Structures are given as C-alpha cells and as structure tokens.
Amino acid sequence: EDISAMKNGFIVVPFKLPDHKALPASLHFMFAKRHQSSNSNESDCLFLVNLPLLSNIEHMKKFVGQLCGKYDTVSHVEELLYNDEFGLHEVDLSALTSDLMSSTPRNTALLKFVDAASINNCWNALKKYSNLHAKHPNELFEWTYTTPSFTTFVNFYKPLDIDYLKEDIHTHMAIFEQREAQAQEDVQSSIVDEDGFTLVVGKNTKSLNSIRKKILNKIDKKAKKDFYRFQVRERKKQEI
Amino acid sequence: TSDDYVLRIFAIAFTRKQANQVKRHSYAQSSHIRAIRKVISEILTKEVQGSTLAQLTSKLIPEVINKEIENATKDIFPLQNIHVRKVKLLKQPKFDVGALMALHGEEKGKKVT
Amino acid sequence: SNIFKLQIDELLEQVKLKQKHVLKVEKFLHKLYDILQEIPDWEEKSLAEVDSFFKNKIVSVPFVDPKPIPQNTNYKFNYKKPDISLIGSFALKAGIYQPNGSSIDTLLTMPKELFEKKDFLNFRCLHKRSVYLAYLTHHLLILLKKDKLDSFLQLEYSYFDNDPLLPILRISCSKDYNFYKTRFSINLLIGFPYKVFEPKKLLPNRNCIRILPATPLYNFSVLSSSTHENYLKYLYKTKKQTESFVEATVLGRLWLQQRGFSSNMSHSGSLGGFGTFEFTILMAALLNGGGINSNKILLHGFSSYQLFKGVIKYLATMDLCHDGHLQFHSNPASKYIDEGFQTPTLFDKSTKVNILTKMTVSSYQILKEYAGETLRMLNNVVQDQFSNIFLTNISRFDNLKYDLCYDVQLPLGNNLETSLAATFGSMERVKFITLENFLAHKITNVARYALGDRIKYIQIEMVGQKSDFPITKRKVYSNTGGNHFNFDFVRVKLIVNPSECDKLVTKGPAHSETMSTEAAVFKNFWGIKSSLRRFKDGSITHCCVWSTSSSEPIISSIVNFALQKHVSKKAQISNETIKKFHNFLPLPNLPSSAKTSVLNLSSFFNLKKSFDDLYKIIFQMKLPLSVKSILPVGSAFRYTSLCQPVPFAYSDPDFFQDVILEFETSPKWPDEITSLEKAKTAFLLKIQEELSANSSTYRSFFSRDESIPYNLEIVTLNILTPEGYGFKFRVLTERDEILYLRAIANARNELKPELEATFLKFTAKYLASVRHTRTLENISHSYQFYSPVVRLFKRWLDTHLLLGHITDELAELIAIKPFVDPAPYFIPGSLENGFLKVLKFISQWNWKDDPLILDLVKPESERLTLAQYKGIQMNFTNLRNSDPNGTHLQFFVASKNDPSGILYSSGIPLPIATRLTALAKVAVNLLQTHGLNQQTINLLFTPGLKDYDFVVDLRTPIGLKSSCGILSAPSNFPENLNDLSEKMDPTYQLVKYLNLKYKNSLILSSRKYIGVNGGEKGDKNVITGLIKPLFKGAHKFRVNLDCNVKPVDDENVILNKEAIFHEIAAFGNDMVINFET
Amino acid sequence: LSLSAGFDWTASILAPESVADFERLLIGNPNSSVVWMNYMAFQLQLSEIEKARELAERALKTINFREEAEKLNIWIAMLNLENTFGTEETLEEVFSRACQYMDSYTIHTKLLGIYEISEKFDKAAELFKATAKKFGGEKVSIWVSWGDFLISHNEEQEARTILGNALKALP
Ligand SMILES: Nc1ncnc2c1ncn2[C@@H]1O[C@H](COP(=O)(O)OP(=O)(O)OP(=O)(O)O)[C@@H](O)[C@H]1O
Ligand SMILES: [Mg+2]
C-alpha cells in the first residue's frame, strides 16, 4: 500500500471494488506507462495492464472524468486500441484468405488521447492518484463493472434483429462486388511493364493477388545409354 | 453403402448443342466420353459410400445426384437428360429388425374369453 | 505369429515355479511317507466299537451324510497299510507358481482286502473310506507330535474338489521342514484300488443307492476315486509322445483361471467343473482322434500354440452336452458320437468314467461361449490379442462378468423351513446327494424355464460355502447353516439377451382343441399369471403379459414371481443395485413415462418424425440454388442426448439439434471468408421468409455461432417446429474447406498451429460431425444398451464437472469401446454392467503409451485392415515422439472416421484428463473394498468439490427442472422469442468465456446440465476453479504475465484472488450467492 | 461422503540431473527457455546430438508463440549447437529457418557473434559481407560492427574501404 510506482516504472492505479452480497476493502490494481511509438495511430497513447473485466472505452471515459474533476485537469480519451480481452481478434481471418475487403499483448490495451496536452495532464493526475493509497485509501474511486456493453454481453441468448442483419448483408455484398469487378478488370486489361513486357493472365483468373500467390507457392529421360561410340566403349570395358 | 449394402448403379447422359450451335450434330470425341465417364463414376462412388441405404434413397427422390453430375461435367462437355437409370441390390447384410422398425417409425394381445 | 510365439515364452517363464521350492517340499513329503509307513495296522470293528475308539479322541470321523446308523451299519470296518503314491499336476511336472498357493495331490490306495465286491452300494465303501482317513489322522497327529513338527503344521479336513462325499486331509505350513515359503499344501486323497467293483454297475445310468432313479454323482465319485493312477499314466504317455504337452497344459490353466474356471464341484453352484485335468484329458483324447470319422484333430508335432488352438476350437464348435458326446480310451481311437445324453459327457470306455460329471449344463454353455469368443480373438490378425486371452482377470467382479445379479434369501435362515426342507425328500436325495445340489437345480430349472429366451446363460452361486472344516467336526459348519445347509444365500447371475430382454409378453405353445403337453406345463407353471390371448395376425396362443417399468427390467419381475411360487412363497429377491442405476437416468416428462422401458427410443423417433415434416417443406421451396442435401447431426438423432427430447422443453442444453444444409455446387461463391459467411446467411434469410409465409406455424429466429475461433460471422437459423422441437440450421459450402486451407498456408509460421486448431474445430463440426452420426446411429440398433449407458455416463461426467472440457463426441467414443472391443468380456446387456465397464476400461487405460482405436462396425466389410491399422499406429508413435509426456494431447481416439485421432480430443487441459483417470481408479477401488451397494453408488455420483481451490455457489432465479422436460411445465413457446432467455441457464456460457480470460492462470469448471444435477428444483449450479502452480506463488512482474495480480514488492506480484472473485461476481450478477475459498 | 481424488497435474496418476527431472520441470514451465536450454545442454553433455535436436523442435512448438524473447533463446541455442557440433549445411538450414521465424537482421547479427566467439573469422568476414549487402542500405550497426571486426584484426585499410561502402549504401 506504500507502493506507488514499480521500479520498471509502471505507475500503480488502485481501484475500489463494488459491493456484492456474495462478497461481503478489496482493491484492483492497474499498471500504466506512457507509450511511445512512431506509428501515428499508436502515438499519444497510454499503455495499460491488468484491466478489469470488459473494460470498454466508456469505462475509461468515466475514470479519466473522475480524475479530471478531482484534479481539475482537461483530459479526453479518444479510443482504447487493441482491447482484446478474450483474444478473439488475434488473427484477422478475413485478411489471410484474400486482400479484398481487408488490407491488413494479452491482458492489456492502449489508451489513446485527443492531444499531448490531455495525456500528460492525465499522467500527472495518475501520479498524484498513485500516492493516494499510501495516505488516504478511502478516496479511491469505484469501478462500476456495469455498462450498456456489459448488459448486451451478459444477454447471451438474444435473437438477432433480422432487419439489422438484413441491412448488413446488403451493404457488404454491394461493397464486395464492386471490389470483385474491379480486380477482375485489372488482371485482364493487358498489363504491360515499363520495359514493354506483357503479363500473361489466364482466362477465369480473378485477382492479380492470386497470380502472386501462384508464383510463391511454386533431359534425363531423353538421354540414351548407348548412342555415342564412347558410350559403347565404356560398355565394352565393363563387359569384359 | 456405409450400411454394407452392395449395390450397382447405372447413369445415362446425352450430349446437347449449345444455344448458338450451327452444326447439325453434337458428337463428343472419345476423350470426352472417357473423361465424362471417369467423373460420373467418381461422384456415384463418393455419394453412395458417404451415405446409408436410407439416405441414398432420400437423394434419389429429389434427383440431386443428377444435378451434381451436370455441375461436375459442365466444364468438360454440355450434357442433357442425365439420369440414374437403374439401381441393383446385389447383396444385403444380416437382417436387423431394430433398424427396420426405426425406418418405419410390442403389442399385447386381447384375452380370448 | 512369431510375436505370439515369443509372448508365450515370456509368459511361460514368468509363471514358472522356482525349482528350489520343489526340492523343499520334495524333501518334506518323502519324509512324510516314512511317517505314513510308521502308522500301524488295526482290527475289524463294528460302528459301535469305532465310535467308542474315537469317542474321547480329538479326531472325529468325517462321515458323509447319511451317517451310518447302528441298524444299517452291519458291515465292519478295518484299516491296513496304504500304497503311497503321488498324482496330479505335480506328478507330471506341469505345475506353475501361484501367489494364493497350489496343492500337492498324494494318493493312498487302501488295500483291496478291505472290500467286498458289493461295497459300492448305499455308501458302504464311502463309510469305510471315512474311518480309514480318520484312523490315519489320529496316528499322524501323535506321530507329528513325536517328531516335534506339530508346531508349524496345521491339519484340517476338506472335501476333494468341493465334493461332499469325498473328504480328505489337508496339510499346511504356517510361518528345517517348514515349507511355508513354498506356498504349497499337501492333500491326502484316499483312493480305491483299481477294478474293485465292476465298472459296468457304476455307469451313469445305473443306480447304487437303493430307495430306480439313476445316481450319476455317486457313481462318478466312487468310480473316479478308484481310477486315479491310470489317468496319470495315460497323461504320462501322451507327455512322452508330444513334446509341447506341458506348455499346452499351463496355457489352458492360465486360460481357465482368468475366466474363473476350476475343477471344483459345480452342481453345488460355483462356476467350475472344467479344470486343468479336464483340459489335459481332453487334449490326450484329441491327440488320438476326435473326429466323427475318427481322424486325428491334433498331431504330436504341433507347437504349444497349435495344441491350445485345437482344444479351444473343438470346445467352441463341437457340442458335447445336448447333441453328441465324445468317447476315448485311456488304456480305441477317439470318436465323436452324434447321440447326446443331455449333459456334458466325455466318456472313457476303458474305465467307464465320465470326466465332466462335475460340469453342469449351465456352466458348460458359458464354457462353450468363452471358447468360441477366444477362438474369434485367436483368429484375429489385425490386433494383438495375447494380453486379452491370458493377462486379464474377468472373474474379479461378478457384476462386470454377469449382466444381472439377484440374491435370494431363503426362509428361516437354524434350518430351512419344514415345507422347504420337506420338498427335498428321499427321491431327490438319491438323485442329488445334498440339499445344496438339489436346490441349485431347482432354482436353475425354474429360473431357466421362466425367463426362457430372455437370457443366454444362467449361473446359480451358493454364496458363503466352505469346504474345509476342523478335524474335531464331522461336517462343515456354516454360521447361518448350523450343520443343515452350507451356504449363507444363493445368488442368481444372468447373461441377458438384449433383443428380447424387454418383451412385454412371453410367448408359449399355440392353442389346440386338446391341451398339449407343452401347453399343460406352461399353464401349470405360470398359474394365474397364465392367460390365453389373441393377436392382430389372428393366432391363439398361451402367453403371460407383464408391465414395463422405468426403474427395473422385466426379468426382475419374472424371477421374483417364478421363485416364490415354485421354490418357496417366503423367498426374498432383491436387486437394488440395478434399480439405483436406472433411477439415475433422467426421467422424461412424456405420457406414461414411468411405464416406458429404458430400451424404448420412442421419444427420439418422435423428434425424427417432426424433422421429416420440416425436411419436406424445405426441398419443395425454391431458391437461387437447389438444395443438395440436408443432413441432421444433432445429438438426439443418434440416441445420445443426456435427457430424452421433450416437446416445448427449451431450457435444456440439447433442445436445438444441429442440421447441416448444403446447396448444389456453384462457382459464384465468394472467395473471401467473411463474404462467404455472409453469402451463406443470405440464403438462410431466404429460407426463413419463404418458410414464414407458406408455413406460418413454424416459428423461426436467428442466432450467432462462435464455436469456430476467428470466424465471427457464422449465423445459424433456429427453427421451432410446431410439434415442440427445435432445429439449428447451418450452411456448408465446398469453398469453405479450401478457404481454411488457404488461411493456414498464408498464415505466419508462429501462427500456423493456431490456424490449424481453428481448422480442427471446423472439420469437427461440419465434415467429421456428419460421418460420426451416420455410423453411430446405425450401430446403436445392434447394441440396444448403448443409448442408456452413454447417457448415464455423460450424467456421471457432469456431476464431477468434466463435460465442460470433454466434447460430447469424445464421451461417446470412450463409452462405445466396451461394445465394439468387448474382449475378454461379453457385450453388455445391462445398464449396470455397461457403465461400470466404461469406468473399468478408463481405470486401466494408459493414454500416455496406448492409443484407443475403434472398429465402428456391427458384431460379426468396414473392419480396419492391417494396413490401415498400422497407419493409425504410426500416427500415435509420431505424435508421442513430439509429445512424450502427453501434455498437449492426452487421449488418442481414432477410427475409420478419424484416422488422425486428434479431432475429438484436442484442447483438453491435462488436469481434466488426469482427473478423468484419477476418478475412474478410485471408483474401481471403491467397488473393490466395498461391494456393489446403495451406499457405494451414491458416492460414485456425488462430487467431492473439496479439492478445487475455490468453489462458487450459483442459483438461477427460476427452477429449470420442469422446463428441461424432467419429471420430478411449458406447453407453448413464448409469444416473444426474446423471452426464451428468461428460462435458460447461462452458466455453460459463463464458464467458457471466463476460462478464455484466465486460460493462462485458472481453469474453471461448471455443471452443464443444471436441471439434472442441480437438486430438486434444478436451480443450483457451481463454478469451481483451479490456480495453476506458477501463479499460485509470487512471481517477478513482467508485461507478459497476462494475469490479474497485485504487487507485494517493487518487482513482485501475486495472484489477486479476491479481485477475481469479484470478476466472477459481477459476471454472474444475481445468480452468485456464496463463495468458498 | 464423496468420490474425491487429489488433483494430479504431472500425469502421475497414469537441480535437475536426469531426463525425468527436466520433463517434470517442463510440466509447469512450458514457456521457460532456460529449462529447455538446460535440458538441451544435458543431452549435449551426454553426446546425444540427435536427441538434443529433437528437444530443439519440441521447445519451439511448446513455448507460447508470444514469448518472442524465449523463442530467441532457443534459436541462438540452436545456432550455437550446429556451429559447434553440426555441419555447414545443418547450420545453414537452421540459419535459414531462424530468419524465417524471427527478425532476419537480428539472426544475422547473432551468427556473426557466434563465428567471432568460435574464432571462425573467415566465415565471419563472409557473413559480414552478405549481411551488409542485404541490410547495409538500412542499418548503420552492421557497418560499425564490420568495421570493428576489421580493426580488431589489424586491417585498417579494409576498415576505410568498408566505411566508404557504408557511405555509398547508407542514406
Ligand atoms: N474330472 C475328473 N475326472 C476324473 N478324475 C479326476 C477329475 N478331476 C480330478 N481327477 C483326479 O483327481 C486327481 C487330482 O485332481 P486335480 O484337479 O487336483 O489335479 P491337477 O490338475 O493336478 O490340479 P491342480 O491345479 O491342483 O494342480 C487327478 O489326477 C485325477 O486323478
Ligand atoms: Mg490338483
């Protein structure tokens, strides 16, 4: 409880847990660093570990909001990237099978902010927050564990809205077929290299990608033992 | 079949002329006939072995087997009037009353007095 | 065959007796012969005089009942020096080591001068034999005292082969002459000289007890006792002729012992009558002929295997009891005769002795069946059958060896009822020497006749029979017997015939103007229960009608009535063990449920009929692509669902039976997986709306399927047939398979194992699932008791919280092993026999080193051939080479359908695999120490729940036992289909997702079926977890810990249990009640 | 009472110095390259080269795919193995396989050190050329390490030549 930051640098972020009749001051500890990355989407992010169950963005919106009011900081979380709590999205099966429609750790996620002004405000708020447990454990906020995404997730046996499903089929198929038609046109359009070389494309070929993957995936019988005089002379040596 | 029912099937098919065909006739070269015959034999073997006798009959009534022969042979040569001409039941397993009753979906008598 | 030859050598040396022990005993009994020669002579005495002689002595004459009375004992008694000789297997040097202990047979031939020619009448010779033994024991005792040897010798009378008329003296050594370590016991058999009595007078048909009825048992006893040394010489010659004689004998001895066969008396009730001597003698006869044409069936040049196979074949194929018998000459070529004596008969013309007189008809049948089954195993080439033939004991449990077991407590059990005893009488006394023999037949004939065709084989066993009694007593003393009957109670063991075990009515003779003899006995036997009835075909026959019950079989009812009416009206018949097992099956909430038998699948067929109505509606529907075929795959289609389907019972897990829908091949299918998945969904929409319009009475809704990892777009149409069933449709496309293979190839190498895992589940649900149901539904019609046992087994797994990890297919394939590969046992014919068997196999299964491979075919094609067998074997050896401990894959189950073997058993954590073996072993050990009884069953089916690290109690808002169709109820689906969730159990979905979070840290288990194993209201279910050892202890922190932990130091964290409890708590919401850590 | 069984996580119901001890350790530590490497060293000390290779392949698949550092330990554990005890072809195969799975330049870097540690300077010189040809246009470290290798071996004029080539190739 005296601990505030781990020597690897991770700021500890205690939380107070709800009151459930089954479980009659237990805390949940979240570990954070500043995340540095040249990739633009990964820039201005806050790295998080040991997240609570089903921690969607709205859970972080309240928590940063709780921080903002307490420490009068202006901070907004844009998005929570790489929040794969079950690991369902580890492999993008759509990307593997074809390039059309898809051009593409554990127990952790990246917390994106609006600007560097907001994130460093939050980091300072977290630093003060880390100190609270050592002194005054009562004023640690409370993680709710209930949110609209939680309720939908809890209701496993829910028939799907037919109309919403119906609309989804239509738009995707229209999207796919535009891509399918364009790709087929590209392959069979007399591609020529800058050096006046014409690519060979078979009939029924659909995606120039498939041509690449075909490539990547991929005299002795006509020789005569006795035709030249040196061959027979070799035979005669072995004969005697 | 999978139920150990040895049976013999006969399939009959005919060549057809395309929509824009101008030649009077539509004979197929012997290479195509052998190619078609190889495909037809494969499908008949695949369906029957991957099925029971009861399941096989359930395929015959809608004549789904014929449509698959067409879809497989569509590339080689256009065909018409594809049908399963005949089926012979050469050999049968030991009789199993339990299976027969299940296929058809015991009774106390009446006192005689 | 060379593998088999070596295996015999390895087995032969293992059981070989150690020669040092032979010398130690050979030291003893050679000296003992001196003591026997020390014993003096004795004079003619009357029964009064000998009684006075023994009146004060410690020894008592073991007279055989009826004991000699002064009036009928006019003939006098006398003793003379014997002719000491050694006989038996030890004589032939064919003995083997036995941990329990072997017996040395020493024969003393009382001199012929002590006989009159007519001493074989009215137990005259037997009574003389008795005192001759007693006089020896008297003097042997004092001479034993003189030599200072009595300190470590324990002398007691016993019956030879449990033959009441032939008492003998047994010498055993308790812990220089001390042979206790040898594990031997010297038996003193007092035989008669050869040809004292005319053998023709002693044939089985003739009688030697005046009262005329024949006396086969008494005639054999004296005649055999006079012909001992001759058969030794007979065996000795054949041993000299054929070199492989002794090796053949030991194999038969091992073969006999595993089946619980012995030379002991069988008319008393115990299984036996065919021992090493009978097996040996049969070989000797067959080496001198055996055919109907008197041609040799065995040749002296045969090896040990060939000799054993020939004898095994001959017993299996030739009938020796009802139709035909075999005659041979010990001192003449053996010839098989067609005429039969209705009893096991192996006649010996040279001696006029029937060697199988100790063999009962019922026992002989079980012998014939065992021989034939082993011949089948012997002729098998694909699988090695050495261990099954020789290295497996089938007699350890009666329940596993016999389909049904009934114990019958006879009345007034310190003597039987006067009425019961009065039934014995004199005429049966001359036929059957003892009441135990007579009662054994009485139970057998009524039990055999009443059950008739419903059974295959019957055994009547006298529980608590003793065969060795102290020298101070004249006969054995049973505690409940009181010198009246040597048994505590009788047990009736059956081998039921599944095809007709459950008939409602027992057929009988057809009606006639004049009552036929068969009609007479049928009417008399069944009494009021008899009835004359007409049928739809128009026949008139005598028949008796019973009532089916879901708690017990018809056979229990028949025998209970059968025994009371004929044996004794006070008899008590109780088989509670079978009753408890039947009740453990879920009782369906259908009309007249309690009266339906457990063999009735009417509930399943009703589901199939409703499906066919939907099956018709779909084809006549028009779509862009004509439907290729619709293949039902759901559990209820193959008679495996734990609870029988009930109309409108939608709370049950197995309400919605999956069905595969396949359209005709088209080349337009999307090449991209999600496009392909959503292309499939479009077709289901078209199927849905047309079905809605034309047939409004079908109610349908859409659900998502996430069984397949990373394929998040699968949508399945759920159809609610008006009759009250559910169906889940899914679309299979031929492009689907090749797309997955494309994903594997293009995936990164580190990811390839994961992608192939996804492919494994796809082929598990779509491609494999079809071939399994097809083979399993067909086979089940041959094995009637498959659907009950596999259902009850799946009930067992859920109670111990295993079904969550064991896929239902794997449970089926293990549960069918005892049927398709029943060796060395028989095919199960009872719920209790089959279930314990599945527990037995799992107990002795070494899944780390042994693969399980099954031939899913009907009883004797599609049987695995040697090439295919070896190929599957090769897969296992290659696999364990990569996984020697078995941590990745534990159970290797394969067949024609799954040659790979890893399709149905992948992804189970090792803790769950070991538990399923650990639970099995403890169960069998529990059955071993404590007999099969009500208390034992309850322990089997009640979970420990204490070993798990933390236990969380959950309660559903509403009891689901009614909505699961389980009779301790809904009649229409809710108007809003959203209401279905209000009557469902989410726990199976709760645990599965939480397992995925804590896969690195915890292993959570829950009861899938809450209605069956959740108490009276079916609302109590329990989630139980396990902390893996790594995260149980403190760890240095790292970004890759991937667990919910709390710090202790600057670089140390520990598993935050209390947080995880709250994670579960919010996740269960109102359901969670209590937490136990 | 109940049918209760103690939980077995070692399949037992069915420092390290032996085969069983390492296998026992791996039951609870499938992700530990230190255990796998130590198990590998025991077989190597036991002259079980063929068996040690088998443990190399098992360690690759058994360890969780996300333990990139632990995977790296095996691959260097391999490259040392074929370099010391194998042949040129076997080392080349693993070298080719290693770059397929892991970052190629890092694998190229480690083999360069292995040759230096084993004093296979001639092969180290060749690998520096091949590595520089492939990654010279992007990595300055290869040129610096190659320059150090030449300067350490008292080849100053060669080091100047490589620096000139580094300037040409590098942006
Ligand atoms: N069924 C039988 N018919 C005729 N004689 C028999 C029969 N059974 C036993 N005997 C006689 O009894 C003697 C001893 O019988 P027993 O069955 O003990 O012999 P064994 O084969 O040596 O037995 P063990 O297994 O104890 O060594 C046999 O040598 C034979 O003389
Ligand atoms: Mg004996």
Side-chain angles (χ1 to χ4, degrees), chain C residues 1-45:
Chain C
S1 176
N2 299 355
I3 296 94
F4 198 84
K5 263 55 172 166
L6 183 62
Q7 292 272 58
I8 302 157
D9 301 331
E10 196 275 329
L11 183 62
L12 189 148
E13 58 83 20
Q14 211 164 260
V15 303
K16 174 182 308 320
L17 55 85
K18 306 156 54 53
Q19 73 86 10
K20 47 166 286 186
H21 301 109
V22 175
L23 294 168
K24 169 54 215 73
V25 300
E26 185 173 0
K27 145 177 173 73
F28 175 50
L29 73 165
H30 179 292
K31 178 266 290 177
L32 184 85
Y33 299 167
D34 304 331
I35 299 167
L36 299 175
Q37 300 149 28
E38 188 79 5
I39 303 177
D41 286 359
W42 181 64
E43 58 277 4
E44 287 186 354
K45 296 292 197 193

Side-chain angles (χ1 to χ4, degrees), chain C residues 88-89 103 105:
Chain C
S89 177
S103 297
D105 298 82

Side-chain angles (χ1 to χ4, degrees), chain C residues 87-89 105 160-161 220 228 253 263 276-278 355 358:
Chain C
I87 59 171
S89 177
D105 298 82
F160 159 87
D161 303 1
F220 163 77
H228 280 297
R253 179 196 294 279
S263 176
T276 299
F277 185 69
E278 292 80 357
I355 297 89
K358 302 189 289 188

